[PDB]
Amino acid sequence: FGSNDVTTAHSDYEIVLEGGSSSWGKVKARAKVNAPPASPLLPADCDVKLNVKPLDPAKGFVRISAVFESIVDSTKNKLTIEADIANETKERRISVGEGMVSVGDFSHTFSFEGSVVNLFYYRSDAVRRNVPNPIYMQGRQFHDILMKVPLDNNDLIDTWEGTVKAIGSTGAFNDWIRDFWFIGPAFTALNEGGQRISRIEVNGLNTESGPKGPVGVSRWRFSHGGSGMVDSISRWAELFPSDKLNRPAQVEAGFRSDSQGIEVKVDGEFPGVSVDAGGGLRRILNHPLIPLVHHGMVGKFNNFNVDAQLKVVLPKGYKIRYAAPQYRSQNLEEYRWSGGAYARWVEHVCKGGVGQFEILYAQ
Amino acid sequence: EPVENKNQAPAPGAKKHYFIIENLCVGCGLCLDKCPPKVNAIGYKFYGDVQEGGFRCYIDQAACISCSACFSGDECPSGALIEVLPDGEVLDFSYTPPERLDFDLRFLHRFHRE
Amino acid sequence: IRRLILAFILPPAAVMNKEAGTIMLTGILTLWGWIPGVVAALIMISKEQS
Amino acid sequence: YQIFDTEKLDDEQVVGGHLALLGVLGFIMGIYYISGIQVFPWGAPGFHDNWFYLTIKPRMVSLGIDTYSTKTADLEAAGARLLGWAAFHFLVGSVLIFGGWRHWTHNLTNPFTGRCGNFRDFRFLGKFGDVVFNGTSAKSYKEALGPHAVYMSLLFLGWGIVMWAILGFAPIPDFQTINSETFMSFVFAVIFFALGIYWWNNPPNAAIHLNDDMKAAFSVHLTAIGYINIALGCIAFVAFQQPSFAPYYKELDKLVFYLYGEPFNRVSFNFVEQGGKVISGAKEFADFPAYAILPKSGEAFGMARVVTNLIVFNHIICGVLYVFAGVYHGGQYLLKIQLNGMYNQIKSIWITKGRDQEVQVKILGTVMALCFATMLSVYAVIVWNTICELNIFGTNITMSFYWLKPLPIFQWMFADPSINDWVMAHVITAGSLFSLIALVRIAFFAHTSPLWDDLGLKKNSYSFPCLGPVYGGTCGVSIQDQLWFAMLWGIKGLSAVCWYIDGAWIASMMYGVPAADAKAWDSIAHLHHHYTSGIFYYFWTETVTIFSSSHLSTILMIGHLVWFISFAVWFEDRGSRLEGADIQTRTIRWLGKKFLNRDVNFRFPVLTISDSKLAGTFLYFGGTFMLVFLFLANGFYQTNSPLPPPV
Amino acid sequence: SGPWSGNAVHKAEKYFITSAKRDRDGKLQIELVPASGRRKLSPTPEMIRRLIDGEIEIYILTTQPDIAIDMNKEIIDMENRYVIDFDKRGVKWTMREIPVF
Ligand code: BCL
Ligand code: BCL
Ligand code: BCL
Ligand code: BCL
Ligand code: BCL
Ligand code: BCL
Ligand code: BCL
Ligand code: G2O
Ligand code: SF4
Ligand SMILES: [Ca+2]
């Protein structure tokens, strides 16, 4: 079989759904890969907790929260972000948030009031009329951020002074900043993910006094165009299911990468899992392609064999007609995919594949 | 095409200033045996009631010769045996294991459910 | 119904959901007092999950 | 004792060492075969009976290489056959040692062509490797498992051919003859061939090994092979007692065995060894030449069960020791990976699932609670049976656990189901649990223990005898010390095995004693077989016959000496011995100088506590089991005639 | 799973206060270093949070260039028990090499 030196990747996935018109879903995903990660700082572990609650249902000011704890080469890192997000218009979105990023001993707290405008390059009705499941939707995003950071430590003050010097001394700051904040292979992910980031435009960054001392206030906009591969652009309404959020949604993920492999645990309960295709049929939502390609960036490094078992737990009286690749088992409401075509598809998408998994299920 | 260079790769087959924290020493002496016989910088200091932990370890810095035998041995169980680097940093061990964020991976369906 | 019958033949397979210590205990129970004692173990634990 | 450590040796060195040891072992086999030649091919009388050849004589006669026939004729033929097979073993072992030297020295150059093959890249046997392997295991033991399975398949096939043609046992399905061993030799070929192919195409993964794992893989496979040995011992005990094996093991009893060291025809003091030698004095038993080793019937000696017990206990002792050693070497690997920090980086259940200290504590606590329960139950049963049979506190045998037979669903395992078999099973479980306490301590508490993580201490050196009297004493806390304690604890389960297989009544300490109701067990319990006397009186009954042998008596004294020498090192005496040895050095110095002008400049050496524990456990085990050998080599001495009631 | 990460003898990762200098006169010269000895950190507010939470354990050696006695907050009612702030507590490791032969 070409080569005999193949490692093993054991994976279990679980998509429990809710009945009715609800798009809610409990998604669990455990994995264990006996393959070396691609982290130059290898003993990298992370624990992510993203919990979103609804506030002001009329205004949609849903408060999302994110806690990324991590330990990379014995370096302890943490990033907390709270943000009231709101779907102002079908194109606009407004967020007011705070946060705190800590690394080892260093730490700083920030706030922001950012507006994102996701403009599609076309809204023609021909494509919608004929194509039933549009995926590659060409578009562009405009972020306008108003970040603020109390300059407490000398690290913050020195960084602010350096940036103030740079923005006025070098006219190519708007270009090379992209090289900066796409650190490492992230820059590659721009070209191989179909996303082009335009030069930033600083409306003005200027320090001002705050309640905890000086506050560096940076007001800058930037742009982010997606050829269609970008799930954050092509699927924008489906990205933010605020109208479908009544119960708190929680996603606790984590990995434990090391020199010998990657352990992954994900638990989640969130909307947007089920999408009405039309005619009463529903789908497990289209797979975002950016995760697939960005992982295939670190997927084609070792030859591996996958033991992947997907378990779809549909509601009480919902059939699963036309689920290609087909399942292996079935308990009259609990369908299992394992081996055969599904394992090939898992190896396909674990290595950068963006193929389809159309789990169309009835009512 | 055919013109080539030639080569053969037969792969195919076909300063230190070691100290002891008297607070944490348990007086095992595993570091004393490593000290060179004549140096004997490391010595035993007794408070009383050996079983109560009175006996402890001390490095006479005057006698020490920075040979690293005591600390490089990886023999200190308590971590009292420390090394202060020339710039200055206390090392409780030759290499501490990296810090990790751990969790028990229990699978969902096949191996270790829940 | 699959879990309980698999348990009556393979109790530790039934407690596989439980912790590795419980699984090892159920395996030992299969080894000593096979079925009655270990079937007791599996029924206790599974009914407790209920 | 660490010169041939796994780290010090690479894979090719291990291949060569195992090959050279296989050759040495083949030489040993030839030695035993020749020792088995009762009559030489030239006509003269041959070697006496050795346990080394009486252990393999059943198997050899099974293969027709030896014969139980008793005439000088065809025993000369059996001797010639044994000589031929011993010569074959000798030459093949010479070749194996040559290959082992080449692999150990890495000089894998053909003496004819000179081509230096590569351990990393080599076609196996020529074209067969191309047909099957398509190219060797580029690296990895995982890719080697399939090739080794194919090698074992070829070994099975070769044994089938050898027994079919050389030893004349055709492949026949029926499992009542050696013929099936040919049949199955082919079966297990295909299996261990096909599986090999599978494991060649689909390799297995346990990532803990495969990486720096000669010690890790060695530990796992040594534990596995220890359980293989235990299973082989059980299978040997069951099968060798089955009728199908009677032609080869039960017919020992019909033979008379002249064994070295057995009673020798004694001679009066006024004895002269000239001519007939009769005039000077009188030999003990006439008709046998003076000093000749007198015959011993296998019927009285029970040589069938003696040889069965020796083989079974050999495999059981080897397997228990291998389990303990595998857990110990795995603990050494665990400690290494804990020190270097790979422990948390291992991504396999065999390491990850017990990563938490809470689960380790719960596992060891469950083992300890089960051990307490079972030991207390069995010991209460045994001591109560002793209280009853000895009629202590006014008791009598009627109050003993004679009713506590194994349940009817478990009496198939036992010929004569009684309380003895119940105590055997539960004592085996309890001894396994006891030794498992230490084995689990090695497995989990190799680098740090909950007491020690609370006490702020870590186990680094994997052999440190202690950390001192801190916290009241830290003796024997290394994984090596836990291995020693595991061995000294498994001494008792292994004893129970010996005493069960030699016919002892282990349900009471004083069965067969001439006191009170000790001899009433056979009536109250309705036993068929008259078990050899109980745990304390078994010593006496077996020593009736150990004492009758000069050789067994010598073993008794030597093993007892070896055993009690162990306390000089195991006891908390090392410092006393060091002080006394300093006094010895000074005494030698000044006494010699006064007595002889030459100076000494030499010191008496005193073992470290680590070496002290090592030697002490070695001596303890050696004495204990060199004496268990006397228990198993005196004779079965368990008759099938129950003793009537004492009154 | 916590005893096998870092040194197994310290439940809370230990940080020795190696270097501190009065010349900068701010006492920011306090340079905490973990027992691993790979991060010359500083007493930031996040380090304060870690110390109060018990995740870390700041310690001081006796044999050193003096860190700051009564210049870095000190409690001397009993034997000295240095504190970064009254709520903090830098437990001083005692090191008797000179007093004893
Ligand atoms: C990732 C691809 C795009 C992009 C796509 C989007 C999209 C699309 C949106 C934003 C939004 C925001 N972006 Mg952006 N964003 C980009 C890069 C940036 C950069 C930068 C690195 O320079 C900055 C400063 C920002 C700034 C911001 C804020 C103004 C705003 C709110 C963020 C927040 O609350 O997150 C809180 C932090 C998290 C939720 C953590 C996890 C983030 C990931 C990407 C989401 C995974 C969701 C998961 C699968 C499901 C979770 C379910 C749970 C139940 C919640 N973006 C890149 C170029 N960004 C939002 C906006 O419109 O605000 C007005 C929004 O909807
Ligand atoms: C060079 C490419 C071809 C062409 C190839 C295709 C293909 C193939 C498809 C469409 C499709 C569409 N075409 Mg067209 N189309 C052409 C010319 C046009 C003109 C025009 C006045 O010339 C118009 C109004 C349209 C209109 C439309 C849309 C209604 C429709 C769906 C959206 C889509 O993305 O459009 C794509 C439109 C463009 C490719 C070009 C539109 C040109 C505009 C009007 C004027 C010049 C713009 C710029 C200066 C130069 C051209 C840049 C190109 C993007 C390379 N086409 C040119 C001549 N078009 C899709 C479909 O069937 O939807 C149901 C589809 O799959
Ligand atoms: C600030 C970020 C943006 C945003 C940006 C995105 C982007 C970008 C994506 C989603 C996607 C999804 N988001 Mg969102 N989304 C926001 C707000 C929300 C809200 C809400 C009401 O506030 C909810 C409930 C959701 C829920 C969802 C689902 C509809 C969908 C994932 C389906 C799936 O099964 O996930 C199952 C997923 C899991 C099993 C694994 C989750 C792993 C972790 C916890 C999240 C990813 C982390 C990332 C890789 C690392 C950190 C990123 C940043 C650098 C900090 N988002 C905010 C406003 N969302 C995806 C989708 O399908 O788009 C169509 C997608 O591509
Ligand atoms: C005793 C209880 C345990 C045991 C406890 C230990 C301990 C404790 C240690 C080892 C060590 C080792 N053990 Mg061990 N180990 C056991 C069983 C085994 C078996 C097996 C039979 O399957 C094997 C292959 C090994 C393999 C090994 C090596 C990995 C390693 C180095 C040995 C060597 O170089 O020593 C060199 C010496 C030997 C060759 C053995 C001594 C025998 C002599 C040389 C034999 C010939 C002379 C004569 C016949 C008998 C001796 C007495 C005479 C009076 C001279 N162990 C037994 C059952 N093992 C050591 C190591 O370094 O660990 C990392 C170590 O410290
Ligand atoms: C039956 C299958 C057993 C097994 C049985 C044995 C036995 C038995 C011995 C070894 C020996 C060794 N084994 Mg092993 N071995 C197995 C699987 C392994 C695996 C593996 C799975 O990959 C590894 C890496 C090893 C590793 C090793 C080395 C430490 C060593 C071979 C090097 C050599 O000979 O040195 C060169 C050394 C010499 C040739 C000198 C040998 C001196 C004398 C003749 C033997 C010394 C040891 C002792 C007397 C044997 C006692 C057996 C007891 C009676 C129970 N074993 C399994 C578990 N292995 C030998 C060793 O050195 O043990 C310490 C050895 O004797
Ligand atoms: C008893 C003999 C010993 C032995 C002694 C020797 C000697 C002597 C030599 C080698 C040579 C080699 N050995 Mg060797 N070696 C043994 C077992 C092994 C094993 C193993 C299967 O575990 C390995 C990995 C190797 C590895 C190697 C190769 C690197 C090399 C052959 C290159 C190749 O293309 O040859 C193709 C064939 C091989 C891979 C040989 C495989 C081993 C066979 C079983 C040797 C049998 C020799 C015997 C006298 C003939 C009996 C044949 C009957 C059919 C039974 N040997 C056997 C068990 N080895 C040879 C050399 O350098 O070749 C160029 C060489 O001259
Ligand atoms: C079962 C087949 C093999 C086996 C194969 C392996 C393999 C493979 C590995 C070990 C390893 C180890 N083995 Mg082992 N080992 C066996 C027998 C034993 C016995 C014994 C007396 O029975 C003991 C005490 C040990 C001890 C040990 C340690 C030295 C080490 C694990 C340390 C650790 O952190 O574990 C953490 C604690 C655990 C993981 C506890 C849970 C146990 C696991 C999940 C499996 C068994 C339980 C099973 C599910 C029970 C229920 C059903 C029954 C089968 C009927 N092995 C048998 C012979 N062992 C590893 C090592 O490092 O080797 C050097 C290693 O790689
Ligand atoms: C046969 C068994 C024993 C001896 C033989 C002996 C000999 C001996 N011992 Mg011992 N011992 C125990 C057994 C024996 N101990 C037990 C079971 C315990 C458990 C408590 C124990 C404990 C302590 C402590 C705590 C200390 C000592 C010492 C100390 C000595 C140093 C000098 C001296 O005493 O000479 C007086 C002792 C003699 C010279 C004995 C004369 C030889 C003999 C006639 C024959 C030797 C037979 C041989 C051993 C068999 C095989 C040999 C060959 C064929 C391979 C010293 C020669 C200590 C000293 O160094 O201080 C004096 C010390 O502190 N012990
Ligand atoms: S008695 Fe001996 S083994 Fe025990 S702690 Fe003291 S020196 Fe160590
Ligand atoms: Ca006997």
Domain with residue A88: its CATH number is 2.50.10.10
Spatial distance between the Cα atoms of C1 and A271, rounded to a whole number of angstroms: 32
Q: What distance in Å separates residue C4's CA from the closest CA in chain D?
A: 23
Residue D323, H or E segment: helix D303-340
Q: C37 to each of A9, C24, D173, D404, D647, how far by Cα in Å?
A: 36, 14, 39, 18, 42
Pick from D352, D466, D469: CB nearest B105 = D352
Spatial distance between the Cα atoms of D480 and D485, rounded to a whole number of angstroms: 9
Spatial distance between the Cα atoms of C22 and C26, rounded to a whole number of angstroms: 6
With an 8 Å Cβ cutoff, are D347 and A261 in contact?
yes
Helix, coil or strand: residue D331: helix
Assigned token pair, C9: 């033949």
Please spell the DSSP secondary structure of C4-41, one letter per residue: HHHHHH-HHHHHTTS-HHHHHHHHHHHHSSTTHHHHHH
Assigned token pair, D200: 């060649």
Give the list of residues 6+ apart from residue E79 with CB closer than 8 angstroms, or none.
none
Q: A197 to each of A182, A240, D177, how far by Cα in Å?
A: 10, 22, 81
Q: Is D322 annotated in some ligand binding site?
A: yes
What residue has token string 């062509």? Answer: D113
Exposure string of A153-187, with b = 16+ CB inside 10 Å and e = fewer, is: beebeeebeebeeebeeeeebbeebbeeeeeeeee
Atom of ligand 3 at shortest distance to CA of A231?
Answer: 66
Of A287, A304, A313, which is closest to residue A343 (Cα–Cα)? A304
Spatial distance between the Cα atoms of C37 and D485, rounded to a whole number of angstroms: 30
Q: D180 to each of D88, D173, D236, D626, how far by Cα in Å?
A: 24, 5, 17, 36
Assigned token pair, A184: 């490492």
Spatial distance between the Cα atoms of A97 and A113, rounded to a whole number of angstroms: 6
Whether A and E touch (3+ CB pairs < 8 Å), yes or no: yes
Give the closest residue (by CA) to ligand 6 atom 10.
D108
Assigned token pair, D188: 């297990």
Spatial distance between the Cα atoms of D449 and D481, rounded to a whole number of angstroms: 14
Please spell the DSSP secondary structure of A217-280, one letter per residue: EEEEEEEEEESS--HHHHSSTTT--STT--S-EEEEEEEE--SS-EEEEEEEEES-SEEEEETT
Contact B19, B59 (CB under 8 A): yes
For A294-354, the three-class secondary structure string (H helix, E strand, C coil) is: HHHCCCCCCCEEEEEEEEEECCCCCCCCCEECCCCEECCCEEEEECCHHHHHHHHHCCCCC
Give the closest residue (by CA) to ligand 3 atom 43.
A253
A75 touches chain E (CB under 8 A): yes
D360 touches chain E (CB under 8 A): no
Backbone angles phi, psi at D201, to 5 degrees: -80, -40
Spatial distance between the Cα atoms of A320 and A316, rounded to a whole number of angstroms: 12
Q: How far does CA D628 lie from the centroid of its chain? A: 11
Contact B78, B51 (CB under 8 A): no
Contact D540, D411 (CB under 8 A): no
Spatial distance between the Cα atoms of A92 and D145, rounded to a whole number of angstroms: 61
Pairing of strands D532-534, D504-505: parallel
Q: This structure's resolution (angstroms)?
A: 3.1
Spatial distance between the Cα atoms of A239 and A227, rounded to a whole number of angstroms: 17
* Helix axis angle, D609-633 to D479-501, nearest 10°: 10
Give the list of residues 6+ apart from residue D243 with CB closer than 8 angstroms, or none.
none
Backbone angles phi, psi at A116, to 5 degrees: -115, 125
Spatial distance between the Cα atoms of D473 and D456, rounded to a whole number of angstroms: 15
Q: How many C-beta atoms lie closer than 10 Å to residue B23's C-beta?
A: 16
**D408-415: Cβ within 8 A, 24+ apart:** D415/D529
Question: What is the DSSP secondary structure assignment for residue D14, as one 8-state letter?
Answer: H
Q: What distance in Å separates residue C13's CA from the closest CA in chain B?
A: 9
Spatial distance between the Cα atoms of E77 and E66, rounded to a whole number of angstroms: 20
User: Ligand 4 — pocket residues by CB below 6 A?
Assistant: D 1-6, 222, 321-322, 325, 328, 332, 480, 614
Q: How far does CA D337 lie from the centroid of its chain? A: 30
Residue B75 pairs with which residues in a beta bridge?
none
Contact D310, D630 (CB under 8 A): no
Contact D155, D192 (CB under 8 A): no
D642 prior amide bond cis, ω within 30: no
Give the closest residue (by CA) to ligand 8 atom 28.
D577
* Residue D642 burial class via C-beta count within 10 angstroms: exposed 0-12, middle 13-18, buried 19 and up: middle
Distance A192 CA to ligand 3 centre (A): 20
Q: What distance in Å separates residue A231's CA from the closest CA in chain B?
A: 28
Of B2, B45, B9, which is closest to residue B25 (Cα–Cα)? B45
Identify all chain E residues contacting D344, using CB atoms and an 8 Å cutoff. Answer: 1, 4-5
Question: What is the DSSP secondary structure assignment for residue D280, as one 8-state letter?
Answer: T
* Residues shown for chain C: 50
Please spell the DSSP secondary structure of B32-75, one letter per residue: TTTS-TTT--EEEE--S-GGGT--EEEE-TTT-----HHHHTT-
* Residue A319 burial class via C-beta count within 10 angstroms: exposed 0-12, middle 13-18, buried 19 and up: middle
Dihedral, CA of residue D125, residue D128, residue D134 and residue D136, to nearest 10: -20
Spatial distance between the Cα atoms of D247 and D66, rounded to a whole number of angstroms: 13
Spatial distance between the Cα atoms of B101 and A69, rounded to a whole number of angstroms: 9
Dihedral, CA of residue D317, residue D320, residue D324 and residue D326, to nearest 10: 100
Exposure string of D494-516, with b = 16+ CB inside 10 Å and e = fewer, is: bbbbbbbbbbbbbbbbbbbbeeb
Identify all chain B residues contacting A256, using CB atoms and an 8 Å cutoff. Answer: 100-103, 105
Structure solved via? cryo-EM
Distance A175 CA to ligand 5 centre (A): 66
Residue D114, H or E segment: none
Rounded to a whole number of angstroms, the CA Rg of chain B reads 25
Residue type, E46: E
DSSP alpha helices (H): ranges in E19-72? 45-53
Atom of ligand 6 at shortest distance to CA of D147?
Answer: 21
Q: How many C-beta atoms lie closer than 10 Å to residue D488's C-beta?
A: 19
Pick from D138, D202, D207: CB nearest A261 = D207
Q: A35 to each of A32, A255, A301, D143, D235, how far by Cα in Å?
A: 9, 14, 9, 17, 42
Q: Residue A327's domain spans which residues?
A: 5-363
A74 touches chain E (CB under 8 A): yes
How many domains is chain A built from? 1
Distance D350 CA to ligand 5 centre (A): 24
Backbone angles phi, psi at D413, to 5 degrees: -65, -20
Contact A232, A197 (CB under 8 A): no
Please spell the DSSP secondary structure of E58-72, one letter per residue: EEE-SSSS---SSSS
A69 touches chain B (CB under 8 A): yes
